[PDB]
A paper describes a structure:
In this work, ARGAHs from two model plant species, A. thaliana (AtARGAH1) and Medicago truncatula (MtARGAH), are structurally characterized by X-ray crystallography and small-angle X-ray scattering (SAXS). Based on the crystal structures of AtARGAH1 and MtARGAH complexes with ornithine combined with the analysis of sequence conservation of the key residues of plant ARGAHs their dual arginase/agmatinase function in plants is discussed. Only ARGAH1 is actively transcribed in pollen (Brownfield et al., 2008), which likely secures the high demand of proline in pollen.
Similarly to other eukaryotic (Di Costanzo et al., 2010) and prokaryotic (Bewley et al., 1999) orthologues, plant ARGAHs, are binuclear manganese metalloenzymes. Together with agmatinase, formiminoglutamase, and proclavaminate aminohydrolase, ARGAHs are grouped with the Ureohydrolase Superfamily.
Residue numbers in the entry:
A (entry chain F), B (entry chain C), E (entry chain A), F (entry chain D): 27 to 342
C (entry chain B): 26 to 342
D (entry chain E): 25 to 342
The structure:
Amino acid sequence: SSIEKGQNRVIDASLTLIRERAKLKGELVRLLGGAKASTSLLGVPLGHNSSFLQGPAFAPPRIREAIWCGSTNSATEEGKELKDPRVLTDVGDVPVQEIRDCGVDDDRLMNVISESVKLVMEEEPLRPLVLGGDHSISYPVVRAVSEKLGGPVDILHLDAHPDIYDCFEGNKYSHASSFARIMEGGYARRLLQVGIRSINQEGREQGKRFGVEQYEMRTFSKDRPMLENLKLGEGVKGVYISIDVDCLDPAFAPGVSHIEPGGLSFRDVLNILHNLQADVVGADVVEFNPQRDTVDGMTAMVAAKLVRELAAKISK
Amino acid sequence: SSIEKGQNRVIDASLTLIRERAKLKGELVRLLGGAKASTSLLGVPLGHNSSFLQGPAFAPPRIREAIWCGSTNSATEEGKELKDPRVLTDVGDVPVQEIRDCGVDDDRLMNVISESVKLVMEEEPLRPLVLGGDHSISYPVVRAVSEKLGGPVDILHLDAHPDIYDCFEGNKYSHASSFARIMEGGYARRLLQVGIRSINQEGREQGKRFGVEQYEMRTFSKDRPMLENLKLGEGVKGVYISIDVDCLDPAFAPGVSHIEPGGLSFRDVLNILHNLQADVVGADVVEFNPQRDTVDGMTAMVAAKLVRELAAKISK
Amino acid sequence: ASSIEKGQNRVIDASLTLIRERAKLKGELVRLLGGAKASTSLLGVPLGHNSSFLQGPAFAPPRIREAIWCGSTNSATEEGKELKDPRVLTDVGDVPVQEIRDCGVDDDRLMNVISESVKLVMEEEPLRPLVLGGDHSISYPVVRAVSEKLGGPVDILHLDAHPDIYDCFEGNKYSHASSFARIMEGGYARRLLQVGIRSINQEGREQGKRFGVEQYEMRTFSKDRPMLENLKLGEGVKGVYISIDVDCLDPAFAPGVSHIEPGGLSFRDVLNILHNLQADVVGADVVEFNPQRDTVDGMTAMVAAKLVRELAAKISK
Amino acid sequence: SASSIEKGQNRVIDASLTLIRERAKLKGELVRLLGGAKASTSLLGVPLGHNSSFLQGPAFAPPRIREAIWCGSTNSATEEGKELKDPRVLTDVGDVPVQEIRDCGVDDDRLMNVISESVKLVMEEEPLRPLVLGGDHSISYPVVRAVSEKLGGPVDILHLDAHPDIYDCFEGNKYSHASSFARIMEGGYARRLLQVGIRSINQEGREQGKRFGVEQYEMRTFSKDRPMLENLKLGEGVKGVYISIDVDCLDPAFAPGVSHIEPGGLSFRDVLNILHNLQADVVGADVVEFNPQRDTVDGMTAMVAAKLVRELAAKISK
Amino acid sequence: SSIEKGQNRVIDASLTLIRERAKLKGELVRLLGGAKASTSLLGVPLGHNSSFLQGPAFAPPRIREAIWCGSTNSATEEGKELKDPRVLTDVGDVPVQEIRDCGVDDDRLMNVISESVKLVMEEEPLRPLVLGGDHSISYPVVRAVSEKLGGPVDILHLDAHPDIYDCFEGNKYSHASSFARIMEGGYARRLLQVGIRSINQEGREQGKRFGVEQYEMRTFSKDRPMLENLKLGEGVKGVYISIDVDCLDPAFAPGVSHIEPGGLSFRDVLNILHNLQADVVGADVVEFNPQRDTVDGMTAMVAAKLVRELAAKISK
Amino acid sequence: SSIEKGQNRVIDASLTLIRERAKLKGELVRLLGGAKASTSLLGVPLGHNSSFLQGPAFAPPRIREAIWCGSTNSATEEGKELKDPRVLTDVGDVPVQEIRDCGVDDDRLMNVISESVKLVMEEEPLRPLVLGGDHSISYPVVRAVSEKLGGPVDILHLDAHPDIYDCFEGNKYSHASSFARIMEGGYARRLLQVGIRSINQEGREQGKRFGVEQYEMRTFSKDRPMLENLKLGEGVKGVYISIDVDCLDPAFAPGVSHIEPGGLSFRDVLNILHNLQADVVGADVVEFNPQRDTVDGMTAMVAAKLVRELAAKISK
Ligand SMILES: NCCC[C@H](N)C(=O)O
Ligand SMILES: NCCC[C@H](N)C(=O)O
Ligand SMILES: NCCC[C@H](N)C(=O)O
Ligand SMILES: NCCC[C@H](N)C(=O)O
Ligand SMILES: [Mn+2]
Ligand SMILES: [Mn+2]
Ligand SMILES: [Mn+2]
Ligand SMILES: [Mn+2]
Ligand SMILES: [Mn+2]
Ligand SMILES: [Mn+2]
Ligand SMILES: [Mn+2]
Ligand SMILES: [Mn+2]
Ligand SMILES: [Mn+2]
Ligand SMILES: [Mn+2]
Ligand SMILES: [Mn+2]
Ligand SMILES: [Mn+2]
Ligand code: NA
Ligand code: NA
Ligand code: NA
Ligand code: NA
Ligand code: NA
Ligand code: NA
């Protein structure tokens, strides 16, 4: 009624905001010349699919402040210039809270996040890097990348958790279920999960069902050489990388909802990302919880540096 | 100039979104009936006019979380029910960071902010409670309130500092120059400044020159009775309440950019607000810096409860 | 079968026997020194599971004891009593609440154990119980136990941001938000003065009006302060019980709470009320200190400890 | 007089042991009624910190550990796949009421004897095996003594710690947390003592290791020693293996909530590489020296302590 | 024993260092003059007479950083300019840890503290404001001011504690015996102890024995009107103010070694200082413990603003 | 002009204080007999050459406290006894803030630091270990060591940053330029920078210009065997080791002005220091920022243990 049409006008004005801002970043990259791919940040400030704490809703603006901190320089480790738009642009945040606040259901909210990602991909040669937000957001992002490209992607999923519960606590959009949604829908072929150390019988059974390659930290000593020399995406249209910050031991990343000892070092993660051979078509950095971070924002710098090194990898 | 016209498509859509949200809230309040005035939150995540720290840019979403925290109930001290839209609605945040990012200068930003305030006012019978954001925003909110209403207002300005510097560090939009801009444009008649304990010889000269009633904490013992029995707005369009969070002793409100000992207690602030007779037309809660808050968000709960009590006074 | 309830009973009985043996030694110490009319004895009830928001008060009583004896402090109360005199303060320790919960004991029988533990202290004359919470749910079994033992209602001074008189908060009758409904329902309290109230809803006020509760809100503290720094309670009944939720204090003074509620009393405001109260105090509690929410140096532990020290000087005589 | 004092204390001690015995009896009956278990980890808390040389914070640890084991952020499966809500995998007989026993004047010899008897009460309920939550490292002595006396012979011990804890009498306290492994080696309770993660030791510690034939692995040789330490075999021919983990075996990056910050320690993953690969019939274990008052505001060291307890439980239970 | 020539030239070089900087500060003040009194800061970074924590050793450099923090203005509540050397100069810190390390005894160390205070006074028109350090430093500072002026002073002593034990734990220089030492020496006519709330039998007896006026917080309701209208020094050499930061409720000043609930507000102390009628000849601000302070240095700001307000009272 | 006269009397007393203390330590070392080399701590509390925060100004006293903490023992990892003066003495802190305050320029302040180092070196057989302070101090320290020994040294520089900017933000004494100053003076033959992970085009170009061996964390897997087997100083005057605490991953060393994820573990650094073959003639531990440390001083312990293990290596 009056309501459904009111909701459509807020949704439409939200998509228009992303569309106009993408257009300006696309024109800016196309004007400078030569880029084959150019990382564009899209923020999805959503936390209500979280099982424990909703703090990731507040992450994307903290991440951006950390990327540009006066304490850092603008060069990535392998020497890309983050001030160059062909390396990194930013189309801003999906207005999630404003959409929820007007009574929009999750089916439609997640549809708006997909469309938001399509708006970036439709500006050549931008490729999306999504700032979460809780891990529920990887389903509408991966769906949007798969649909746009016209086939399943191979995924590298860095996570303490496999996020492959059929329906965690009745919520099909649970942050603990988004890789079940992705695999059910035929949006991914290979799913490599690395850093896994919190998994139950359902996680293992769902892993076998979907053909997932689950690397547990209890075999990391033996798996490290293979994980520091990954080659992904041959025979599919691209590779997507999803990083839950909780792939890192809490010593490196305390600013997470799920503290799970025995994880990767920051340098372990960069060894995997730097050495990965892959046509990276998209990526996300999720589950940064600023409310659980240190008083000085150490996990914000962790999330920012992951974003920066993913941008170097995506942009070419 | 393809970008200069493109800036306008970002602004148009930015304001479109505020209006589309404003109408839905408008409609729900008019459906319910009986409201003369209805507090509607409008966030202004702007901190780049700050002299020391830009942390208030992150405040409005934290304030909103604290209002609805499971630890609290939805009753105000007086007994007003915050779940009733006649009492409180929220039109969300102005996308200041997106606007800044598409290269728009401060003139047009502050005008977009003024226009956004006007969009809420044009939806009867909503009255704007702006969540700052640094002090800089009061000037465009007040100008927009003063323009819409057709003439000057009187201001209750609760703050440790007086913020009437002519031009502070060469920025005319400085959070320290905001009330100099307001007085200069005759948007205010009586400016009552309360909780003042950080003032310089320029602060006093400008206060006399604009005929400002500056109450210093030095005389609070004698002043309390007068301060706890205030009446304002007779002969004017209305009364604007600008509450900088540092009016409170840092013991109550650590989460600010300027720690200034010898402040008000939270109860002192409620004594003043509960007792003040005013036609309140507009109110801001500013300078709340989450990056300076306690790990448990004590200042977020302070900001939230001042918003709640301010909304129980504005709503009628 | 009923092998379950009987096994639970053996654990409950052993739990109560341990409080009995501890209370006896403290009793015998106070009697052997001689001259006490009343001797504050601490009983901890490390219980958090009736909270609506955070269960951290389950951990408070050990932290409060540490703060009472911190080497940064001396052993004198403000009005000059010696806390090292067992006649002024003793400690019978903690009800083993978690271990009773862990063997499947329901809340009715668990609250019965708390009551029975309070009686066991009262039955070593001249001990009077000062209970360390724990969440505010515990005041119900404590006040029930004191009233039943003294054989009549008491007057209660209740210092709290919240009135805690929901008929059944979230369906739990033992909710920390319902303990003073449970108390007034049972006729264990004649007068109930609630002081520091600044978070209350229509049901709060309707339940206030129903049970004859005197609700002093902070929006009228300027006016009410003279009368509140001059209380007299308990005349014509068995005595006065003082319940202090640490959230009566503004969070500036007491951040270590589950419910941050700006606009509360100063610590000095609470000692003015306590010091000047005229009352034969038969029991007290300090509840809702949440160590998990405290500063890293334990400021709220020192607050809860000093409230305990000033209540002990008041109860001991 | 002053001998009647000892009789009142004995009433508190007996009431304390009776309470542990009754809790242990329900846990043993539950495990046995479910059937099939050969061994079932049962937690025993010993909230003792007064033998500490710097901070007594470990007295507050056991309840914080239990909370973290059941934290709603976590799931109930161990890394290897054991279900912690199965009583045959984990039960909990609660805490020894240490503070109350100290508070009625009981001397340290009698208090440590209570800790020993409490451990035996768990072991007496077949098939429970004790996993002790400290508490400072002093408690390892009475625990290891009870396990050895009850099994009727020596155990091999894996001791994970920044410190060897083998001073004869640290600051005149024979029950010092820095002397508990001297107490253990003097009593004949151990065949092998392997000390892993050592990085704070002096000549007295090295001399005491030689005197008792302790095998001391220092972090300065961890590059060389790692393969050996990640393939340990212990307890063949004796009553089994006891594992004592001082949380300060971990670099303080991983475990800040300790009284003794000693940079250059093991990663959490390094410790699980050692535990997971250890071949051992583990007859008991402890997790000690978690200091909640030195932890982060979010309890990161509580979650470290809890995950060590959970992984040990998965190893003890079978 | 060539340690004597060393100990001696270490001491001489320490004293030289203060003489030289006093000479420069004096010259700068008279250079453009018309000042009767000018406040000069002297740090005594001494904490080893503390009974619990020694953290006050580190305070004086932290107080200086807070006085000149970019978040603050250079004007005092009354309106004096701290950049004006006539109002405030700074002669740096007595090298206490350096004198300690060469094996010098507490008797001689405290003499150095005394000598160092006289160096500031010997340089007209400088008046010493000492940044502690623990409360032991007040004995030698008051000794120096009294001997230099040749007569006793009236002393306003703000503290949770009376610091008047005969020999706390066997140390006659205990921070808990400074006022026993002062009273035994005849340096004070009147001693007013304000904010007392941790006192035992020995505290009351020593008080009665020395004629000390002990204001306990439990009578502050009745004493406030009187404490906010003091008059001291009339007839004797002048007024010394000693301020233990723990005079303030820990809500206002958590950065102390002794947390003692139920203290004064920051505005309470300012009401006492602003209305104190007195010729103030010296003052100290002691027992700030930076190791117990909040992460953002609230108590540092609290000690700095006491120093700034004291300097506005002392300078003229 | 008598200002200039004043400054020289202050510098002289400042040097006179280091001379006399170093005399007492040399005499003590010489009287115990047998030492070839004896580590002597010299503190340089200087932060104003920092680009981001001046916290390291406060570091040296907090390091000393950590070295002697009652939670620790006095043996190093390889068994040296820190209470033996032949293993460790301390000549205390260059009075940096007193020299700045009397208006001395950075040229002369840096020369004072050089002179303070030589005063240690002139007391046989002390060798200097300097506690920073920000990285700017390495230049005047190495310049003094090289001038004193009459030739160049090899340097091991442990840092996240190369600090080799020509003129970072206009300041030739920038903490980000001190190795450009060192390499321009010919004070060093080899400069091995280890743990580098924040470097731009200028850092790389300047590295090539001065022949710097730049070991980046992105090749640490490959490089680790060679870095745990270093031999330096053969055919030159010896080896100087500079340790920026931010060489460590912020997981281990959060108390730094520059959070840079993906660094060395503590054990990594000790594997390098313990296996290094070198005649170490001097060392520094710089850029510990206590205002960014944990509430319990974790980074203070890290800095203390680096100092302790360097002392074991320097003393012989
Ligand atoms: N994304 C994190 C989900 C955590 C959940 N407790 C699990 O079992 O994984
Ligand atoms: N709004 C804050 C203004 C602070 C400024 N340093 C001043 O001197 O006023
Ligand atoms: N300066 C503080 C002294 C504190 C001591 N516990 C006392 O009894 O006063
Ligand atoms: N377990 C901690 C003991 C620490 C002691 N300072 C030692 O030297 O071992
Ligand atoms: Mn996930
Ligand atoms: Mn995860
Ligand atoms: Mn302002
Ligand atoms: Mn302000
Ligand atoms: Mn309550
Ligand atoms: Mn309450
Ligand atoms: Mn140990
Ligand atoms: Mn240890
Ligand atoms: Mn004092
Ligand atoms: Mn004091
Ligand atoms: Mn550096
Ligand atoms: Mn660096
Ligand atoms: Na989450
Ligand atoms: Na600001
Ligand atoms: Na609670
Ligand atoms: Na300990
Ligand atoms: Na002290
Ligand atoms: Na720095």
